[PDB]
Design a protein around this ligand. Structure first.
Ligand SMILES: Nc1ncnc2c1ncn2[C@@H]1O[C@H](COP(=O)(O)OP(=O)(O)O)[C@@H](O)[C@H]1O
Ligand SMILES: Nc1ncnc2c1ncn2[C@@H]1O[C@H](COP(=O)(O)OP(=O)(O)O)[C@@H](O)[C@H]1O
Ligand SMILES: Cc1cn([C@@H]2C[C@@H](O)[C@H](CO)O2)c(=O)[nH]c1=O
Ligand SMILES: Cc1cn([C@@H]2C[C@@H](O)[C@H](CO)O2)c(=O)[nH]c1=O
Lengths: 226, 226
């Protein structure tokens, strides 16, 4: 009965900035943030650092941990007795789909994951999916669209240590896979329904300060149709 | 309503040999073998080989894959509509407990897994446990006890390629952790109930040919008490 909407975008496109705006728009809207802070101290080791420090060594470990910690947080929001409100909406920061079809797929293609790693990752992903898939199905997607170059500047502005080494090239690859999935809708997934799911594309290259009011109307308008 | 019994022992103690004997003893007994054959070809890569080829690189990947593939096979035996028989018994080849408290714990202590790897492994283990723990709870344990030296000879007899490099030292460590857990019952787990679970210890150092008949009576006797 809970509508589930995922917020997709490249690294530093402004997802957390966008997400912090939502609860104040309506009392019925809940948000499940990406556990990024938790990833840099496990329960400790900073596995997010290890990922960027040696992707050939740590991609598989990180990517599978990232996605598991996302599943758990998302499942915990569903059980989390916030079903009782009039018309409840739950925004996911990223989803199991991008975790796999964008982030993990990209590192495999960059040879940061070998065939064995990629095969085990997928096999685990599928299994996670049929156990807790139906409950996590998306009613809609919001794509915060920004150039790789803008993202690169925003990694600098935010100043998250582990991400300061990310090159433009890495962000460019993530960009084209987002565009293939969310704009051209050309990316093949194992999930039929995703190809019909409504998608709102918002251009977030300009300052959040003077686009706020318009972005909000676009979101409110988009939700009505769902 | 299904009694669940796990068969524990060191590498090549004779678990599969013992297990092949059970279905013929009673029509109501089912067996969940360790998916070892599947581990040497993933769905492919031989991740069991990689584990022994470079334990510092592959222990975490293997150990977590080993345990997941064990959970799934075990859950599939429970759902697997073999509840309809008079007094059903399900034998597990090893369990989630040894996977963690013996095999994974040993590699962490040998520095084949770092703190981050060990922490993520445990955290995933716990989470797997509270999701599908209650359904997998053991009513009993059968410890096939053999000297590390006997096991070493049996790794040679069996001739499984990936395991041909295993040194005595590795088997000795596994032996003492089994003895600590199943004989002295001194090993601390996160699972209270395990410390009260009945355990049958069978000495399997002699030839299976002239101990068969006695082992069987011991098993039949043991099951009655449960
Ligand atoms: N539309 C925008 N205009 C100007 N600055 C932005 C905009 N969106 C995000 N920022 C800034 O960029 C940085 C990264 O944004 P953040 O929301 O943390 O990204 P994400 O959550 O997508 O990784 C932060 O410093 C934030 O203040
Ligand atoms: N009690 C026994 N006496 C003689 N040979 C045995 C005995 N148990 C096992 N074997 C032999 O030892 C090898 C390893 O046994 P297996 O059942 O495959 O071990 P596990 O399943 O514990 O890894 C096989 O060659 C098997 O024929
Ligand atoms: C969900 C996800 C995020 N990321 C990165 C990891 C962080 O740098 C950033 C968090 O916004 O996203 C991945 O590399 N893989 C992933 O699966
Ligand atoms: C269940 C399990 C088995 N093993 C090993 C892997 C195989 O060599 C052998 C199968 O009988 O047991 C592990 O190293 N870790 C494990 O968690």
């Amino acid at each position: 009965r809970i509508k589930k909407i995922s917020i997709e975008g490249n690294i530093a496109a402004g997802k957390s900035t966008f997400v912090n705006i939502l609860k104040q728009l309506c009392e019925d809207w809940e948000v499940v943030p990406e556990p990024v802070a938790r990833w840099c101290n496990v329960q400790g080791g900073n596995v997010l650092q290890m990922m960027y420090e040696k992707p050939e060594r740590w991609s598989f470990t990180f990517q599978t941990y990232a996605c598991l910690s996302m599943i758990r947080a998302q499942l915990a929001s569903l059980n989390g007795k916030l079903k009782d409100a009039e018309k409840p909406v739950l925004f996911f920061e990223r989803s199991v789909y991008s975790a796999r079809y964008i982030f993990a797929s990209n590192l495999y293609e960059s040879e940061c994951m070998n065939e064995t790693e990629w095969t085990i990752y997928q096999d685990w992903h599928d299994w996670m999916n049929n156990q807790f898939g139906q409950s996590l199905e998306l009613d809609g997607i919001i794509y915060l669209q920004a150039t790789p170059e803008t993202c690169l500047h925003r990694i600098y502005l935010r100043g998250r240590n582990e991400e300061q080494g990310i090159p433009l090239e890495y962000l460019e690859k993530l960009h084209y896979k987002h565009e293939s999935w969310l704009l051209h809708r050309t990316l093949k997934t194992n999930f039929d329904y995703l190809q019909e799911v409504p998608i709102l594309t918002l251009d977030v290259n300009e300052d959040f300060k003077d686009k706020y009011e318009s972005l909000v109307e676009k979101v409110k308008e988009f939700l009505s149709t769902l």
